[PDB]
Amino acid sequence: FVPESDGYFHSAEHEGSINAIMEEYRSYFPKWMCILNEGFNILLYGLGSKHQLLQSFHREVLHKQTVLVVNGFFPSLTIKDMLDSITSDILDAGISPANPHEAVDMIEEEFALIPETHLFLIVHNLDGAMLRNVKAQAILSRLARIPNIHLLASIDHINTPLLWDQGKLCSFNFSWWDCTTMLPYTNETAFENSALSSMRSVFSSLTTNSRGIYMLIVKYQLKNKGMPFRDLYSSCREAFLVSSDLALRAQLTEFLDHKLVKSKREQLTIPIDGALLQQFLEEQE
Amino acid sequence: TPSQKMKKIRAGELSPSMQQRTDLPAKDSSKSELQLAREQLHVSVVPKSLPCREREFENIYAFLEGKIQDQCGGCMYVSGVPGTGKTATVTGVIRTLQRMAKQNELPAFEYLEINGMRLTEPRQAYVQIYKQLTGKTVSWEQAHALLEKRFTTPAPRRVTTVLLVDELDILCNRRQDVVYNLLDWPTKSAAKLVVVTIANTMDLPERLLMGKVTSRLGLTRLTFQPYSHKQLQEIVTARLGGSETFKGEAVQLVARKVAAVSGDARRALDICRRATEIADTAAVKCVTMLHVQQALAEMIASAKVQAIRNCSRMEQIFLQAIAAEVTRTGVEETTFMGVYQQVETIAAFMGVTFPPPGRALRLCSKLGAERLIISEHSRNDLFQKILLNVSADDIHYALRV
Amino acid sequence: MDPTISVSKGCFVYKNGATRSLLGKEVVQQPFYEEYRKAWNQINDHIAD
Amino acid sequence: RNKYQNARRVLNSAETQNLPGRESQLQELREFFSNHLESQTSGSLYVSGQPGTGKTACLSLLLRDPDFSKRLQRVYINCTSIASVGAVYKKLCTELQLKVSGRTERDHLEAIQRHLKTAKRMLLLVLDEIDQLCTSRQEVLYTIFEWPALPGSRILLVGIANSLDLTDRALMRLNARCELKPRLMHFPPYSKQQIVEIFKSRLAEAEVLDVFPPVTLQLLAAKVSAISGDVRRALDIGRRVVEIAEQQKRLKPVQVTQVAAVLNKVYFPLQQKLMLCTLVLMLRNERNKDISMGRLHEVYRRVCAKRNILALDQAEFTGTVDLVETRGILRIMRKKEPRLHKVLLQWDEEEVHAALSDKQLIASILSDTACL
DNA sequence: AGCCCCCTCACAGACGAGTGCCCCGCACTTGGA
DNA sequence: TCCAAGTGCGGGGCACTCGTCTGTGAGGGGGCT
Numbered sequence A: 001f002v003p004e005s006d007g008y009f010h011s012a013e014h015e016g017s018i019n020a021i022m023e024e025y026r027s028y029f030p031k032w033m034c035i036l037n038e039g040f041n042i043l044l045y046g047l048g049s050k051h052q053l054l055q056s057f058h059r060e061v062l063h064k065q066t067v068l069v070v071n072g073f074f075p076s077l078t079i080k081d082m083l084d085s086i087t088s089d090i091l092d093a094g095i096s097p098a099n100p101h102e103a104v105d106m107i108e109e110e111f112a113l114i115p116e117t118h119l120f121l122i123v124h125n126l127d128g129a130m131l132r133n134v135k136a137q138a139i140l141s142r143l144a145r146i147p148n149i150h151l152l153a154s155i156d157h158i159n160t161p162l163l164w165d166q167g168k169l170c171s172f173n174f175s176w177w178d179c180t181t182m183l184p185y186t187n188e189t190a191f192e193n194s195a196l197s198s199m200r201s202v203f204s205s206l207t208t209n210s211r212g213i214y215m216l217i218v219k220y221q222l223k224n225k226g227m228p229f230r231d232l233y234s235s236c237r238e239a240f241l242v243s244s245d246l247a248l249r250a251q252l253t254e255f256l257d258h259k260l261v262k263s264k265r266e267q268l269t270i271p272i273d274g275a276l277l278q279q280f281l282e283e284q285e
Numbered sequence B: 001t002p003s004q005k006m007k008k009i010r011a012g013e014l015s016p017s018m019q020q021r022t023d024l025p026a027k028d029s030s031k032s033e034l035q036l037a038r039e040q041l042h043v044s045v046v047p048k049s050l051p052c053r054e055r056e057f058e059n060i061y062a063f064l065e066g067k068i069q070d071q072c073g074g075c076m077y078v079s080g081v082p083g084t085g086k087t088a089t090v091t092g093v094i095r096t097l098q099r100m101a102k103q104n105e106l107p108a109f110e111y112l113e114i115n116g117m118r119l120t121e122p123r124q125a126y127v128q129i130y131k132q133l134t135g136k137t138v139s140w141e142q143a144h145a146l147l148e149k150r151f152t153t154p155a156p157r158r159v160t161t162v163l164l165v166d167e168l169d170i171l172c173n174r175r176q177d178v179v180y181n182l183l184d185w186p187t188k189s190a191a192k193l194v195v196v197t198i199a200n201t202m203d204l205p206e207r208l209l210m211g212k213v214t215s216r217l218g219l220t221r222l223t224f225q226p227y228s229h230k231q232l233q234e235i236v237t238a239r240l241g242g243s244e245t246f247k248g249e250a251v252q253l254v255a256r257k258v259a260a261v262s263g264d265a266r267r268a269l270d271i272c273r274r275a276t277e278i279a280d281t282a283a284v285k286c287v288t289m290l291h292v293q294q295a296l297a298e299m300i301a302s303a304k305v306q307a308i309r310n311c312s313r314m315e316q317i318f319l320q321a322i323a324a325e326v327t328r329t330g331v332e333e334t335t336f337m338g339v340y341q342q343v344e345t346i347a348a349f350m351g352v353t354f355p356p357p358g359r360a361l362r363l364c365s366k367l368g369a370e371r372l373i374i375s376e377h378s379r380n381d382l383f384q385k386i387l388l389n390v391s392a393d394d395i396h397y398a399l400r401v
Numbered sequence C: 001m002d003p004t005i006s007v008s009k010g011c012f013v014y015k016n017g018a019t020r021s022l023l024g025k026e027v028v029q030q031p032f033y034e035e036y037r038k039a040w041n042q043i044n045d046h047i048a049d
Numbered sequence D: 001r002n003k004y005q006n007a008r009r010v011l012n013s014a015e016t017q018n019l020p021g022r023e024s025q026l027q028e029l030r031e032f033f034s035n036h037l038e039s040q041t042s043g044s045l046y047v048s049g050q051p052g053t054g055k056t057a058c059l060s061l062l063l064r065d066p067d068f069s070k071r072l073q074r075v076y077i078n079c080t081s082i083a084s085v086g087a088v089y090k091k092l093c094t095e096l097q098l099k100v101s102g103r104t105e106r107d108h109l110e111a112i113q114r115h116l117k118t119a120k121r122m123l124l125l126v127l128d129e130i131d132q133l134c135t136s137r138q139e140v141l142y143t144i145f146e147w148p149a150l151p152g153s154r155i156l157l158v159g160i161a162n163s164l165d166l167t168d169r170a171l172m173r174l175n176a177r178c179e180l181k182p183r184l185m186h187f188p189p190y191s192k193q194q195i196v197e198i199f200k201s202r203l204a205e206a207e208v209l210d211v212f213p214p215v216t217l218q219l220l221a222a223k224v225s226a227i228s229g230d231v232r233r234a235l236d237i238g239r240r241v242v243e244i245a246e247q248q249k250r251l252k253p254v255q256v257t258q259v260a261a262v263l264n265k266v267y268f269p270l271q272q273k274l275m276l277c278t279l280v281l282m283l284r285n286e287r288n289k290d291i292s293m294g295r296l297h298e299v300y301r302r303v304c305a306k307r308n309i310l311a312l313d314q315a316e317f318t319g320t321v322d323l324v325e326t327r328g329i330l331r332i333m334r335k336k337e338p339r340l341h342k343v344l345l346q347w348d349e350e351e352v353h354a355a356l357s358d359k360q361l362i363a364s365i366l367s368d369t370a371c372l
Numbered sequence E: 001a002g003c004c005c006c007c008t009c010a011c012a013g014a015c016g017a018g019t020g021c022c023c024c025g026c027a028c029t030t031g032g033a
Numbered sequence F: 001t002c003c004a005a006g007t008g009c010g011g012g013g014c015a016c017t018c019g020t021c022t023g024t025g026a027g028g029g030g031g032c033t
């Protein structure tokens, strides 16, 4: 694969073959144990989802050793959680310090004392949501350097080695394996990292004065094709919809919090078109 | 020793005493009539019945007597600008109810009081209420757990406990759990809590409280309007009594000048004491119009023209040049460079030579410490910003005349 | 989807007797592992020297 | 004693037994609990509604039934009484009489997770005001709402809240699993006839029906159910009418005029008048709405110099504007130095003209535009 | 006949108050010695 | 008579958070040789 520069400047049998691919990838596991014994780490860079392959390697091979599975595709994990887990849940030595490099020095000092206690860790999506900074990769490269800690990891993004320098690439003693499955990304995309009906549903929950205020805003929006606060205030005080200014301001605050009115300093624009708003207006006749 | 002193202070077993005077305090016979009018005009001396606060007194008294004789609990919100007889009327109502409950005219009750502006955090309210229940100081989580065990569970015979909450707006934080817990316990049937909250702003339930808190707070509000010209004369003429020390026009001018600014009663009761202290030094026994006008000039003071008259020569040249630079370049926020250029022009006009900018920065710092101008740190010399804090006509009134 | 993947935890501990060679007797007694270890120790000591 | 104090005592806005308005929502909750007790499966539930509509009343009427008390173990937890968001697990142990080693929240969480798998009775957990458990990453709410998906568990939980879209904004990840999505239930606001039926239950419970004719109750309900819709304000105004009529008249039943006066009730110094006059003048005769305190003071000084009125200093003018701020006419945006504070008028000019009631003065200031 | 030069507008950054949270010291202290 | 280490709790460092504020990169709009 050699990319060209010009494009930048001018701008069933499938299941049986997938199970055959998975069995041919499951034939690699004692070779992976012999590679992991000699100081290397394992990196997978295929196309499909490699969650089931690492789960099968954990189940069928490492069913007795210490294992720290790290879901790197989780959108709200931290380095403090992983380091506190290694400090307090494996070593039973209290919470790790708040500065993470001192925690890595602590983990190195407590792992130097205990040989033949091999800790495995299986990072699904080493380039995940909260692992894309350089500090997390520096901490992971300091953790993978220890002769007891062994590392398996997955890679999914295309710009992943842009944040590994030669120090982080000589610390990570990687062995690049091509485990290209064809399974879809069903676990990595279900998290938080990846209208009219809501308007009708919220509008069916408001009271009658909120209905009158929102219909006044809708009528002004469909007449002038954003309204200031004083015109809405006079149009609501003429029809006895509000008592004072703070009642209308609380109604508009509830409108901003339920995402039906957009206020910009104080003009009030409903972020929809005229056709859906016209059919919404004739829906209440 | 620390240990037994802390264990006897936290348990509430030693009296928190204060030292006594060696010389015994003075007598009432040794005080003159001007001294008697000076001690009777103090803000600390609350009368046994408040003039011009009768309608609100009957309102709070009817509300609290109904809530005590019904044994049901509830909530009230009174509000008003500071100095208009809120806390005095509420504690007068509570003293009247306690005297009625002593004579077996009313069912008995307990009276708890907290103030939000003497608490370090709002959760210490839980430490204080419990301290008015038992006497023992605990942590706030244990006091909150014990208050929730006390109020939510039924235990006859439970006595009604009226809780007064002064300065409610300090108990409001980002989470608003303390005010929610205080306004939530009357809504239970086993807790006979009648909470009356006092605040300054009239729109406190709509401005910063959440929806459930302003729903629980109720709609039986009360507003203390400020004192007018006529009531603020009646207050002082009821304070002074039948003495002829204050003339009528003196009290009339004091009430007219105070009731046109704010409507505070503390302002009038301090201006009258200052007028008494002025008339003490003139070797007279009556307070005429002149001492009242002098006290009105001294208490309501405006000394940003005398401060410009009492500056040095180069600081007056500096103020003239800041005013001229504001006049020239239109916008008020000036830079020190154009100010120093107009300084050099004005100093070339008047003939006196000006110091270099190493001393003009000292002049600008001296005017900024005196708050005649508003200037930055002097670390960015010749590029610091200057606002004129005094009015541009005050300089022309202070230097021409 | 799986009971291993959750919506709260990010890390999962499988600690088995942790306190404070991966291959067993099958591979170490085989001759190719001993000759590989001997040759690698020789070459590593030579490059270190 | 008499019937006025009896109506005042029986309205009282506190916990009841008979709920005449919630007749279908209670049946829906009972059908949910029966279908989750019969087949012995776990499930979440999220009830939401405006403050004052009857969520805690329904879920406290259900938590005192004897058949559910003998079939399941129920726990009620209010989420505003806890110390912090991460401490609620400890409170669960206090509500379950568990045995933890203590002094850390993770051991409390593991003790709850051990108790949920080996329980002998089905656990119902009611979390009231669950919007106090919302945080930045929300590990506690996602941990709590995941326990139905735990293997071998039997916990079913009900979260009470005011926000309609709390579980769609702050609980998005639970949409990714069809087992873990909590079933919704929105308590609608009360109409007019439901508030009338609530009043007809509360008054005829203690035989105090004679003080309220239906006309005043119809007018009161037609105003309250239109303005806000909650029943706390309805009962509070219905108590305030009697509390006003007892002091006014002293049997005499209330008329339409008294309830109309109560509903239209619930729904100046010289220098402050001059400050409001110069602010209305500066907002009329100038386009941009940024008015500082120094510019307002400099206009007010010329206005006082033309009227031969002794003007105030800036240090007293700031206190005067801060005292007009308490009425609600203004709002002060705060800056570093007190000359720079921004004064925002938050009324209409006709409301200021009606509130001042000094027409010969306020018409003379707004025509005197020479000071600006 | 696709290209050359301004407009402008919500991200980028800062920043600044400001406010809540979590680690950390530290006396309590107590059942035990 | 004392005491070792849990522990309960206050206090400060820190990190988020809401609002303000200002450059600005590239999509967009008006003219071009």
Ligand SMILES: Nc1ncnc2c1ncn2[C@@H]1O[C@H](COP(=O)(O)OP(=O)(O)OP(=O)(O)O)[C@@H](O)[C@H]1O
Binding pocket: B042, B043, B044, B045, B046, B047, B049, B050, B051, B052, B053, B080, B081, B082, B083, B084, B085, B086, B087, B088, B089, B200, B235, B265, B266
């Ligand atoms: N109507 C009155 N009659 C007699 N004295 C009064 C009257 N009103 C106020 N005072 C005096 O002025 C003082 C006002 O105290 P008050 O209880 O009104 O403070 P407050 O309004 O609670 O203050 P804040 O609003 O700042 O909390 C009292 O000490 C009282 O002596």
Ligand SMILES: Nc1ncnc2c1ncn2[C@@H]1O[C@H](COP(=O)(O)OP(=O)(O)OP(=O)(O)O)[C@@H](O)[C@H]1O
Binding pocket: B211, B212, B215, D013, D014, D015, D016, D018, D019, D020, D021, D022, D049, D050, D051, D052, D053, D054, D055, D056, D057, D058, D161, D162, D198, D231, D232
């Ligand atoms: N259908 C009804 N019939 C009679 N009384 C009712 C009814 N619904 C509610 N109430 C009364 O309203 C009062 C408050 O209702 P409740 O506390 O259930 O509202 P809530 O939803 O819990 O409010 P929040 O959301 O603010 O906590 C109760 O004391 C109850 O007596």
Ligand SMILES: [Mg+2]
Binding pocket: B086, B087, B166, B198
């Ligand atoms: Mg007070």
Ligand SMILES: [Mg+2]
Binding pocket: D055, D056, D128
């Ligand atoms: Mg409730």
